[PDB]
Design an enzyme around this catalytic site. Structure first.
Site, short mmCIF file in Angstrom:
data_model
loop_
_atom_site.label_atom_id
_atom_site.label_comp_id
_atom_site.label_asym_id
_atom_site.label_seq_id
_atom_site.Cartn_x
_atom_site.Cartn_y
_atom_site.Cartn_z
N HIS A 102 -28.44 40.12 -61.36
CA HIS A 102 -28.11 40.75 -60.08
C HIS A 102 -26.74 41.41 -60.05
O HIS A 102 -26.47 42.16 -59.10
CB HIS A 102 -28.18 39.72 -58.95
CG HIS A 102 -29.58 39.42 -58.51
ND1 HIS A 102 -29.95 38.20 -57.98
CD2 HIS A 102 -30.71 40.17 -58.55
CE1 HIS A 102 -31.24 38.22 -57.68
NE2 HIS A 102 -31.73 39.40 -58.03
N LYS A 104 -23.68 43.76 -60.09
CA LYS A 104 -23.53 45.20 -59.88
C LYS A 104 -22.09 45.59 -60.18
O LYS A 104 -21.17 45.26 -59.43
CB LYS A 104 -23.98 45.56 -58.46
CG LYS A 104 -25.46 45.19 -58.33
CD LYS A 104 -26.09 45.61 -57.06
CE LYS A 104 -27.56 45.22 -57.10
NZ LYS A 104 -27.68 43.74 -57.07
N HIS A 327 -27.09 45.40 -47.26
CA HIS A 327 -27.38 44.92 -48.60
C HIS A 327 -26.11 44.37 -49.26
O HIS A 327 -26.19 43.79 -50.36
CB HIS A 327 -28.01 46.04 -49.44
CG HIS A 327 -28.56 45.59 -50.76
ND1 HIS A 327 -27.84 45.71 -51.93
CD2 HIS A 327 -29.75 45.04 -51.09
CE1 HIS A 327 -28.57 45.25 -52.94
NE2 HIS A 327 -29.73 44.82 -52.45
N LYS A 329 -23.23 41.46 -49.45
CA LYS A 329 -23.19 40.02 -49.22
C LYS A 329 -21.73 39.63 -49.13
O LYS A 329 -20.94 40.05 -49.97
CB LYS A 329 -23.87 39.19 -50.34
CG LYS A 329 -25.37 39.50 -50.52
CD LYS A 329 -25.58 40.57 -51.60
CE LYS A 329 -27.07 40.79 -51.82
NZ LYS A 329 -27.36 42.22 -52.04
#
Ligand code: GNM
Length: 438
Positions: A102, A104, A327, A329
């Site tokens: 996950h 990025k 999107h 967090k």
């Protein structure tokens, strides 16, 4: 501003809400540096779209895609990249079941130096179009002169910690990037790296990753204040994992306990969870299709109805983004009146054991399934005791932290329901006139 925390540009809000925002074309622009090579760590990739985001003159520079895909998904990605000779792929190993890559991150090597970008968007058009997404931009890190011996290390240990994170992949293409980082001076970095890598960590390694990494940083570099039990914890995310049959199983036992930590010494701390309601999604800029990126399944949710009593709606008037579904967090520790914060974290990690880790083997081992990455803003790293919360995200002593959504968070109303992506919504149409029929 010293924080270099940005939101992505949102198509459809007034210019005043995009003035200080960044599109991927801006990040890759020649104004940021003359690109020699880049690594794109991500989850989902649209390779045709991605290459078009680089400036024309940079589109044949080498790109490395770091991904977690296996089998047919892996072949699809290789097929996407095959038309582009300059694109290499690196498959991150996922040796624990149900793990994902996950993280990025962009590593951008220039003629002028190196930049690190840690963000929350997938490399597809829709993640940069009408979503609320976060970006941290490193300074331009200069090259250390050949023959000069210095660490190039920051007071937050960012250089060592970023190398540690990359070494965990055990991958040849990333050893090259590790050697690049060794050769640059990262001493100006004022954020701490918080990563997750898959594995089972005990002993010295227990504090390296996940929520134990966060706990360790807060123990060592934050200070406890009087009435700390009154300072809430806020978590804001776009997906929820299976957390167990009640709050004592994980959420309020080990997760909240790590998040509550402050200072070196030894609960009724309020916990606010922010997660879009069905109404939030229905009335969003994208409509119900925004829910395609909020993958909370009915199977998981029906086992933990206790959780939803913690849920607060998405609201972001402060940044003009109440209708741009999150999107991003984020996790933070505000004061009881929400006017300051003890720390702020932006990350790829959702509210799940997979991302943050779960204790095993009688509390001696931290098991993590996934790769995740975020950056932690601590007042001590900026010579401060706390951060004042910026009243308007894009307004304006520039030592106030830009929180991208409204405080205090607003509890779900009695008619509200958490967005659950694999059930139908046919009671009321969305902003494009459609219903949701999975
Ligand atoms: O880490 C990420 O960015 C994501 C990971 N998994 C997802 C799924 Br499964 C369904 C829809 C969206 C996402 C997503 O955005």
């Amino acid at each position: 501003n010293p924080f270099q925390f940005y939101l992505t540009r949102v198509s459809g809000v007034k210019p005043k809400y995009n003035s200080g925002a960044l599109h991927i074309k801006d990040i890759l622009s020649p104004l940021f540096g003359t690109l020699v090579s880049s690594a794109q760590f991500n989850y989902c990739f649209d390779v045709d779209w991605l290459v078009k985001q680089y400036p024309p003159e940079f589109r044949k520079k080498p790109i490395l895609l770091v991904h977690g895909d296996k089998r047919e998904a892996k072949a699809h990605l290789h097929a996407q990249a095959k038309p582009y000779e300059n694109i290499s792929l690196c498959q991150a190993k996922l040796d624990i079941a149900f793990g994902t890559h996950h993280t990025k991150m962009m590593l951008l090597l220039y003629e002028e130096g190196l930049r690190v970008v840690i963000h929350t968007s997938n490399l597809i058009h829709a993640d940069w179009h009408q979503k609320t997404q976060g970006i941290w931009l490193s300074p331009l890190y200069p090259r250390i002169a050949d023959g000069t011996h210095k660490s190039g290390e920051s007071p937050t240990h960012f250089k060592a910690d970023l190398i540690s994170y990359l070494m965990a992949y055990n991958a040849p293409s990333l050893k090259e990037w590790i050697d690049v980082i060794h050769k640059h001076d990262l001493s100006e970095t004022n954020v701490y790296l918080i990563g997750s890598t898959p594995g089972r960590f005990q002993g010295s390694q227990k504090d390296n990753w996940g929520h134990f990494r966060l706990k360790k940083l807060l123990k060592d570099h934050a200070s406890s204040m009087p009435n700390a039990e009154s300072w809430p914890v806020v978590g804001q995310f776009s997906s929820v994992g299976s957390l167990g049959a009640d709050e004592s199983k994980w959420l309020c036992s080990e997760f909240k306990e790590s998040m509550l930590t402050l200072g070196k010494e030894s609960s009724s701390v309020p916990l606010y969870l922010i997660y879009p309601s069905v109404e939030n999604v229905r009335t969003s800029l994208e409509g119900y299709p925004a829910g395609g990126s909020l993958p909370y399944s009915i199977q998981t949710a029906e086992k933990q109805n206790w959780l939803h009593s913690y849920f607060h709606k998405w609201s972001a008037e402060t940044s003009g983004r109440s209708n741009a579904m999150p999107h991003i967090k984020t996790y933070m520790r505000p004061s009881p009146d929400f006017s300051k914060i003890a720390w702020f974290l932006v990350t790829s990690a959702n509210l799940s054991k997979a991302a943050w880790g779960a204790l095993e083997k009688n509390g001696t081992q931290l098991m993590i399934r996934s790769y995740e990455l975020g950056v932690l803003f601590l007042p001590s790293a900026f010579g401060l005791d706390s951060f004042k919360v910026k009243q308007k995200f894009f307004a304006g002593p520039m030592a106030t932290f830009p929180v991208p959504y409204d405080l205090p968070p607003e509890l779900y109303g009695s008619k509200d329901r958490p967005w659950i992506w694999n059930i139908p919504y046919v009671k009321a149409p969305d902003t494009h006139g459609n219903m949701w029929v999975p």
